[PDB]
Symmetry: D2
Subunit: 229 residues, 4 copies
């Protein structure tokens, strides 16, 4: 089973955790986009009812609108029952790196308050340790970008300002900030790294999502499997 098939199978499995009268955090990225589309189809056909989505990005929000899924802001709802999203890396303890799509801040805001956080990934996302393949995206107040790079470099991270393709200059997040991608060698304690990185003045949020994922749905090459803690 190729990559797109792996993503699709994970998205389909996620639907099994969604019920009528739920407020659902809507993730960002290609794997979760399949889930949003399928959810929209179920709602249109009447197979599920009374669903509201709380989008983690404009991407998720616009896609939900296109698919006629009711949308609400976090401060509009009383609670997020289930949040569904993807990940760039998932380590064996179900700690994640997220942020390749630049939406890590709203993602954490919404997923932190979720009853159940369900992560959708294809096989390639499973790593032996965080930063085996991907850098940690860090959202930063623009004025602080150079100072933060310097400081991370001392910490032995290879850190670079993320640059635009469909704009000149740096990538701007939905919040108007810059993103530094910091490749650390290997993160042995994700939670404490997550906490202490946020203490750096100018750091808005970082891409380590430790001790938050409840269920990881993995589209493996030979089918769907789940990891839980």
């Amino acid at each position: 089973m190729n990559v797109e098939e792996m993503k699709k199978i994970a998205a389909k499995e996620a639907l099994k955790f969604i019920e009528d009268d739920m407020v659902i955090g809507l993730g960002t990225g290609s794997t979760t986009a399949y889930f949003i589309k399928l959810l929209g189809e179920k709602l249109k056909r009447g197979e599920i009812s009374d669903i509201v989505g709380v989008p983690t990005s404009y991407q998720a929000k616009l896609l939900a609108i296109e698919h006629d899924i009711p949308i609400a802001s976090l401060d509009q709802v009383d609670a997020i029952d289930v949040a569904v999203d993807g990940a760039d890396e998932v380590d064996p303890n179900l700690n994640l790196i997220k942020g390749r799509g630049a939406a890590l801040t709203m993602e954490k805001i919404i997923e932190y308050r979720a009853g159940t956080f369900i992560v959708l990934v294809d096989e390639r996302k499973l790593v032996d340790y965080l930063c085996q393949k991907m850098p940690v995206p860090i959202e930063v107040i623009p004025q602080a970008w150079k100072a933060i790079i310097e400081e991370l470099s001392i910490f032995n991270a290879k850190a670079e300002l993320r640059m635009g393709v469909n704009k000149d200059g740096p990538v701007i997040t939905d919040n108007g900030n810059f993103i530094i991608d910091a490749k650390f060698p290997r993160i042995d304690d994700p939670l404490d790294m997550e906490i202490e990185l946020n203490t750096i003045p100018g750091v808005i949020e970082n891409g380590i999502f430790a001790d938050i994922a409840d269920i990881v749905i993995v589209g493996t090459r030979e089918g769907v499997k789940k990891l839980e803690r």
Copy 2:
């Protein structure tokens, strides 16, 4: 000779308009990037003095810093003597389309106040009529994006929301807004279309730059050529 060579020769010619003690609007994009490097080099050699650049984007700002050119934002200076910038299209009346790099708002803010606005282009940017080759970028308040696209259908604009590559979702400008690229089949009155677009609630700025460029320096396969009003 080739594209980058054409860009460089236009950038070198632009130095002819720069004198000691000037405040210079620093444009965005690759053609002007050559000008900024050449300017920084002339400053380092002492061939020019007391120059201050007013960057039209983070890209321009960072580049000027790298080349040790003093900079200031518009509200720090009392005049912009000369502004130098590129363009996506240049018609025979010196009307331009700008905004492919998504920095059109700050570009127009600075260039509008310039004593002389000098445009740098290679041969490919010249068109017989605006929109012969490129769409008009329009920066908009995010929630107005869908209505604006629909409203532009009266001009048969094939308007689309610009999507990110190094972020998921829409491109976000330095000002936190979306960009719609409107592919008009033609614009027979650029000045009044520029006004029309600016009268639409939700539009921050649009990429039609009519009645503003003073000189266009063109790098051609046979050397430098100019256009003037």
Copy 3:
């Protein structure tokens, strides 16, 4: 009737224009707050149903959420049926000055698309000519504030950067911009000035709302009056 009762009676009259299944633009400020509250109670009692509000500010959004009115951004809906909002000045031709609350951009975005735009004011808001009592608020990209104040002096506007009370420095709008309050002696041609101001690079919106209001409901000392064009 005292002033508060004048506001409330205008709000009560606006409700008569609201029907089931409508999408309603929700204005900003104290007069419209009465309308939002009254609408919420009608919805709560089931006297009206299936309403969606599109807020013109965080103030309106949070108030609507507090009163359990479903909320959506402009790009979430297919149309605005009716928009209700206040005004700082209303001239004999029903042209307005708005923006004292600093939400003029989203207000115009939503109200421009309304099937019917209803304005709510108490007696005090009626004037013989725009700028008889209040300045025109102008929302600007921060960097352009100084140049714009200088440029407005040409028209003999006394223009000042609006300053914060509960923050140091300038007032920041919901869109991250500054507000210049420009006091013209008088505005004999609101629509033309409105357009002229929006064509200045750096101006993203201005408080002249000309040729947009459909109905102005005035709360007076004795009762309610409806003004139409």
Copy 4:
């Protein structure tokens, strides 16, 4: 002496720490405003030279410009030699609460990197413990405001969204965010609390400034007093 006199003498004492060729972080608020003024005057008299200021807010930047002090952004300089700023509270261990002026994020960004951080206050600012007289300002991503207030209850904090006076709705910071002012009973472990608050998803920065101030200059009714770590 009254408060304005206390502020002025603290400011005058600060000047003594400034040397030629320094890069100085320019604080926000009335006390530091005196310093900036004096610095500008000294520079004009030729009593000091080659000074560059890095402003912590638009207020500080605009004041520096008015006093002809050259300025630069943090990403333009290689170091901050001295940072001068005010405070809302100073405890006996020289931990501070800052942010009444809403500029706490840029303040901490610049002051965190300063060779020496000098705090200027009048008598009223000294406290027995943090939160004796003032709340802790917390800058937050707008959508997270309600969730964060609710979560702050575990600290028995009285937390409120800061509201605008010269705008309707919430105060917006220079970064486009909201401010929650949280009144804790008292803070016994300022650094620990400073860290904890920044771990909350949606919190950009908080007003506790622990283990950062080097010198606190206090204007009192009996003259200047200099506290040091």
